DNA sequence: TATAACTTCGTATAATGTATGCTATACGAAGTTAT
DNA sequence: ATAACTTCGTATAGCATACATTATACGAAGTTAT
DNA sequence: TATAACTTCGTATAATGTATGCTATACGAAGTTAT
DNA sequence: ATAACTTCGTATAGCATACATTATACGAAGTTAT
């Protein structure tokens, strides 16, 4: 069909309208689905519902997460819907089976994990140790953890901070201007303020890195063996390395990860977000203020991190013994 | 017509998409609709809005509640939508009778109900009346009333408990790990501390019952007319029974049921939930604390349980009393 | 057209799906539009945009409120849309002229008025006088004002209160169950609690009226010359009479209305709502609690009663002199 | 084609549907689009999405802001929608470039701006520098800066003020009745108290100006090079002039403009609004109090003015400082 | 040189929220009028 | 010529109204147990 | 009877918010099993 | 026969997930100034 080619061509022409990660996962899903189709001699593009049902069942049978299976469907759905074709999910075979796969897995324990929390106590411990070190690695890392926990920004937001994004209060606290986040793309964007402590941590790093040469440098950059910063205004510190700082800081305190292969045996990119969310809840911060903290315009995900603070809470118990 | 045959096979094949309670209600509604149709010379499938409209008006004439009339309409919508067919509710005729029937029925003052509060006033009365009775079922029921008040846990939830789900903490207080979640984006297991007095009751029951003798054994079990427990791990105590414990306990104090045929004359499955929440807000406890105690996230409902408390009477009452 | 007749016939068949006031104003607008069409020899049913534009301009030219003109359009729009025909507002002639008429009127002062406030001070004054009277008129009226100001219910909500809708707290305060309001039609509905003062006022009235004979009596009923109540379970006190109580209570204190013909020279049905809203704001009640008070699920109308509390507010002024 | 001729006549005829500022921007955009089309051999009307897409990409290449690119697109959407024609934005091509252009531009860090804060630090500086200067324009400007700080009133709003809109209260404080509303569901006239020091300045100005000599005379008026005021009541001082007072006042202290061509180097119309709000939140004032001071109901905006204040730094900063 | 400390990348899995269309201001710059 | 505007055009920040009902507001006429 | 105190009604004008579709419990009642 | 269930059906209250992305998680391979 002429129209389908056109629609696809249009989406590719302005591919920059979508996150690069959407593209990353579009192609990845397409590769997996392409492969399954080839293994079973099946037309892979206009995808047949029943074929899609077999494929979701096969993903299930490989032991894949409910959420990852929803991903494979999601991209297939997007590829079809933006083509002008009907979505696989538009048929019952796919709809019902997706709902069924979720029900079976969930009803056998499957649960979406969350990042191991990096909370205030963790931050103070990390800091009590590393604040002394005059190494470049250590000063940078300590400053990044500070920002992460102070501001609750995602790591991709942190790696985009430019030195000119930083301003100041009369009070002396650093403010970091963010524009783009996951949930938001604006020109006015948001301001996130650091405490006086974290501001110092960040001053130390600026000072010692020489990022402030060009004010269009990324606040965070790489640091080599010899301890020399490598500022850039065109290459940011990969988010993979910020994941690494979290894994190294965890390793520093708790030693090496298990042999098991499980996710979340050590801190990761999101660890400071669930942790600072959680600390606020427990100090009585109001639910709106928590949402303002993490950029959350809606209430449900925040309830869904105090999710697992829901431990022994024991209101009724006290009531009972008196 | 061939399409809808496919769509109905899609449904039987992926029947595990829905819980067996949904299928139950689906089947029940179809039975009611098909009867009505036969008795009124109407084709039952596909349904035509004129016939669906008369049917909903028959359901109103019959005294059925509005939530009930919605359910019949819902499953009819469901059944037709899961085939290639138009839903009744997408017709102007059925859409207007639902509106007409809703408001009509509220004007004659049909009232949504809820569980009769089983409170602390009531758990002392009961304890008082059978604290030190040595009957093996009097011991079981007393324990279970404990767990239901303390943990505001649903009834199917208490059915599932086992002895392997019971650790300890300060004083003795038992650690009931749970499946309070049957959802993906939701806690990976929750936890409930019993009081010391209630931990004591779920001790004395474990003695007599002898449920410990297997980990995989369910906590609550059947107890026959000879006061002997009958542990199992393939067979959990039904919800209807746990219901029964509550009604029996009501009969104990207040005697035989009021005989209107009405609902919520005795206590039922939820009475302890309702009661505990009310007790909890009476002594002042953060509403979102209450919300976490029985795993609510949709305050519409908990609100309805504590409405007639004096602590909830609102701002105007507060102002007026100067 | 056959379809248009059918659609209209369907709406009339289940007319009870719409408020009777919608019907009242449908016919009233139709009468006015019918009349204008007859005066200008114009087809009145499928209404021509340009004819509708002339008619809105004529309503403007009679000096009618912007909001009343929006009403005439509203019903014309509804009559057409529910017929299956295009709305007048679907054309530019009508759209643009409506927007223009609003702009001209507003840009010459026109503003939507609000009810004269009946606030706490007013209620205490009214009460300081009438609380003594043992007349039936006075006891009833005083109790209605109490409820109005205490609960913020609209008068139609107040006239629907049945004696069985009333319950109690442990604390001794009356609760009044509402089901239907303007913005809401439910079976669970809402509970509104009276203070201890208003509860007394209401006790006096119940006591002295004999409404509590049949518990399906309307809490408020008429009272004749001789001071004898006339309870009914099938005829409520007209909302026009509740408007009258407000006008009489105003007259009692401030004397007779002007000669001017202006609306809101004396208290009316909504006077206690804007007044209690306003009092809450000024005592620092939180904006959510205000919304809970008046049944308001959204924030804008409440801002739009503290609307005209916005008087001399003078935060900046204090700042300036120090 | 005849339809769109009707639709364009509908528009000229009801041209008062929109403000003359909307028409201005509409006309401006058409001029830009038509030029671009001629210069690029494209039909200007109806617009085809391919051509609109290239045009928006030309607007991005030209350095225009995203709010600006939206405006061009908006008026194009408007113009076409008010004819029987499809909007550009309803095409997949233009929809994706707008997305692409938005995020693209935020990544090179284009930043939404706002008025440079004219604060109390700045109104003392100014007063200091010209408190007791006897120049008739130095007297006018000083007064007006007063009114703008004190009342956070927009500039067109201050233009409209007259002497007949000025009563009194405690000490002298002037009573500026206003048209802060140009909306129906909105206050029926508002009110602003000036301070005593500022009331003094709007006294000394009325002396010299001689504006009192007619009620209907506008408060602020033109003052020629011979230090003589020129009252009018048919002619209000333009907004561009009131702007000018602010820039002049900036030049006074800081000298000639920074010469980047940039925006918000001096103060402008809104500077006093911005400044006053910031000052108001600095000394702690309920946010919704601030919101009422300049008639906001959409806190998105006021938030943006007080972001870098230390009192607004958020919960995390508060927790971290123990 | 070997090596820290990356980047790049693939597949795997969590998170996150359900909008614009009109109207005001900003400002350089050209037009107007009386000093 | 120039101060001190006003008018303008193009660039951006700042805001409010439409839609589909459902309700109250009030003067005026008909009703009914005193 | 005249009259308070309505009801009914018409036209006029303000107010008010942008949802369900699945899954659990309630309970009388019939079925089952061991005392 | 009966207590004490379980299973059932029909009646209602109580709840949670789908959708379209955009992001992080982490092991493993290629890179590069020391």
Coordinates of C-alpha atoms (C1' of nucleotides) in Angstrom, one line a residue, chain B residues 24 28 31 62 65 67-68 71 113 140 154 183 222-223 225 238 263 273 305, chain H residues 1-19:
Chain B
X24 CA -20.0 -16.2 37.0
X28 CA -25.8 -15.3 35.5
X31 CA -29.3 -16.5 32.0
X62 CA -38.3 -5.9 40.0
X65 CA -30.5 -1.8 42.7
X67 CA -25.4 -1.0 40.7
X68 CA -27.1 -4.3 39.9
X71 CA -23.9 -4.9 36.0
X113 CA -25.1 -0.1 51.8
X140 CA -10.9 -20.4 66.4
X154 CA -10.3 -9.1 53.1
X183 CA -1.5 -6.5 40.9
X222 CA -12.7 -26.6 59.3
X223 CA -13.8 -27.7 62.8
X225 CA -19.3 -31.0 65.4
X238 CA -14.2 -21.0 52.4
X263 CA -28.7 -6.7 54.1
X273 CA -12.4 -3.6 58.1
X305 CA -16.9 4.1 56.4
Chain H
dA1 C1' -30.8 -36.2 61.8
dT2 C1' -27.5 -32.5 62.4
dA3 C1' -23.4 -29.3 62.7
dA4 C1' -20.5 -27.4 60.0
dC5 C1' -19.3 -27.1 56.0
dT6 C1' -18.7 -26.4 50.4
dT7 C1' -20.8 -24.9 46.2
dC8 C1' -23.8 -22.1 44.0
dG9 C1' -26.6 -18.4 42.1
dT10 C1' -28.1 -14.0 42.0
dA11 C1' -27.5 -9.4 44.3
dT12 C1' -24.4 -5.7 45.2
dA13 C1' -20.1 -3.2 46.9
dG14 C1' -15.3 -2.5 45.8
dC15 C1' -11.7 -1.8 43.2
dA16 C1' -7.3 -1.4 39.1
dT17 C1' -5.7 -1.6 34.5
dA18 C1' -5.3 -0.1 29.7
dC19 C1' -2.9 2.8 26.5

